[PDB]
Amino acid sequence: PQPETLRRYRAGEPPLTGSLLIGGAGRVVEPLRAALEKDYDLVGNDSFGGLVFDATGITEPAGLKGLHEFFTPVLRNLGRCGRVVVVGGTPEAAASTNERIAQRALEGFTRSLGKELRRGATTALVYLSPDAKPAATGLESTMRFLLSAKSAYVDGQVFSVGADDSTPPADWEKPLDGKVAIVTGAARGIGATIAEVFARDGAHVVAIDVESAAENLAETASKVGGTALWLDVTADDAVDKISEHLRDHHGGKADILVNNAGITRDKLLANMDDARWDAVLAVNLLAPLRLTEGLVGNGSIGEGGRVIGLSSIAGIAGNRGQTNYATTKAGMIGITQALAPGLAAKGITINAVAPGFIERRLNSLLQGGQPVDVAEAIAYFASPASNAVTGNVIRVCGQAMIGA
Amino acid sequence: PETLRRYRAGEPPLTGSLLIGGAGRVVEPLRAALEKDYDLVGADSFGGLVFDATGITEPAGLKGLHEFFTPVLRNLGRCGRVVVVGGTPEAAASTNERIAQRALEGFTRSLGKELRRGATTALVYLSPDAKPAATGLESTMRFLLSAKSAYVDGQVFSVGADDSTPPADWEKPLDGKVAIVTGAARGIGATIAEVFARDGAHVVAIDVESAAENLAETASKVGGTALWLDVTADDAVDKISEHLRDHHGGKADILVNNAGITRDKLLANMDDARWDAVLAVNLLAPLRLTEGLVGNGSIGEGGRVIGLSSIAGIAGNRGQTNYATTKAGMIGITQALAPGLAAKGITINAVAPGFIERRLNSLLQGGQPVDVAEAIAYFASPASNAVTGNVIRVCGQAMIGA
């Protein structure tokens, strides 16, 4: 079982290499068909490039059967780098506990199916607010991202779409036309590729990196048709400096901020010095927070704004030698979750991307566990003293590597 | 691999001293609370390192984690326990405080991967509405600060605001309690019965009739009762309720939905039988038992529902689209029913067992920078205004996670 060469985005190419089957029952199927009919080859009863299942109509666990009924007969016809998407209803917003449970259970389904798919095929779960209007226009960008070569390395993940309508870009292939985007860490690596992708999608990019990036940063700004700003994002004056650059080049405004700049100072916590802790917190956590609040606070980024942070799987799973780094990346999730409410009021979205690997004894305790260990956790919940503990889900796994 | 210290009656909870530090609202209450039963310090190894992160109100403050742990970690004992206690981030007073407190999970999970000799880490969040004595935290801390938590490592616990009363004896906590344990004939269910019995509970041990012998056997080891039945049958609730009216004055305190089956199969090759049976036992049944027993008064104030989820339900597993669905569902039950059960004085929780006695992703390859950029480009879209607060891995579905 070798890796498939992942189909990636190329301009002008069809978004899927095969047909799109949209099934299921609920409030998404009709508009999603309506919305995708022209750009995608919709089929119903070649290979399937995408299978999309509306699970939003499943309102009790009993109805989970629909998943099986839809997928089993079609999975054998899924194409190279095919896309499986289940769309569900935000569980927390369900009309009933029955519906919440069924809609929550979907994620086990999609993550499991992800591990069954072949030839570079992926799964995604997308939840949509029950307050979305029937046209479900707020969902379209997610679906088109998923149902394209663009999402090539996004697999088994969960997306959450709110209630709001969306207007499409003039051109889905030039979706950031006209937009001004700041990308930190842009001289090289993922930063530089973000810049490029942004420029490719029509955005004007302000490429930020540290002064020592030198010509690398100028190469990036040159390549993407944008501007270079040399800057330490940790500096007190960083927001003023970027604010000035924006006044100079972009009428005092950016649309998009990507906090991509980050450093590692790996060291076990037992051997960690102040420098390696502080530097990593400064760049990875404090600077992005300060840039976001500075640039939103002084009106640089207003209504329609986008902030995207680089989190990390280390931030999610922890990593050895990376208590500093992982703290910052978990921090980045925290920024994302913490500011989302405030920024929404301002018409600004904040999201994070957590890259993984980008070019038994499987647990911290290095052993299988015993039944008593599971029992003990259950007895802890059972205790009359544990009345303040509810709604918890605790793995008894010796910190198994495996997870979401 | 360290031979893990497990609970034996009448040993000290930890093998060394307990250091409780930090600044915040939990340090003093916890010291005062744990001073008799533990060897509080504030040479010999630390059995326990507890750090109160609840004073950290902004990310600059996270330095505190480092200032506390770095100089003491080298002195952590065999099967030591590191616990960080924070404020529930959703409930912080400021975005700065939420961010910092949210950050702690990256810390604790990382450190967990650094500790040696069977030592573990935990994160406990405590509601900022908890009273100063933080009595509701105690059981969590004692569980963690003991050998009972041997295989629980890197996790996060979330403690609400309600006060607690300790059991009469922390080492017979379920004394006078009646526990219904399903799938109790064999395996994890049997051990749950054993541990409940050990802790003083009378266990009502349930399994299928084809398992009657092992069940009787289990009921006997635990001085409990064997009630065999199909939990998926319409009459399950009634039968259980009858047993309770007969033997325990119509009341149970604890329901553990442990019964489950696997019918593994790639979804492409799965028949209704493998799907439906898994659904029936693992999701429909526990939901029916729980609503059923709570609904008719069998489980009331002070009651506990504990469900068995599974790592498959969190991470997904190949060939278990069915089982994972039910196990994530079981998370669903836990989450969905918590608020309405809280109102009835009942808690519902789930345990998710792990293994109990570049290419590491579904896409079998590393990603490219463009893959990340595209995800970022998607959020950046003007048409992605309805998408906020999302965190999305770009990882080819890496095996690694929480």
Coordinates of C-alpha atoms in Angstrom, one line a residue, chain B residues 22 94 101 155 289 376:
Chain B
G22 CA 1.9 28.2 41.7
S94 CA -10.6 38.0 29.6
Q101 CA -5.5 28.8 30.3
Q155 CA -5.7 14.1 29.7
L289 CA -31.1 2.4 29.5
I376 CA -5.3 29.2 4.9

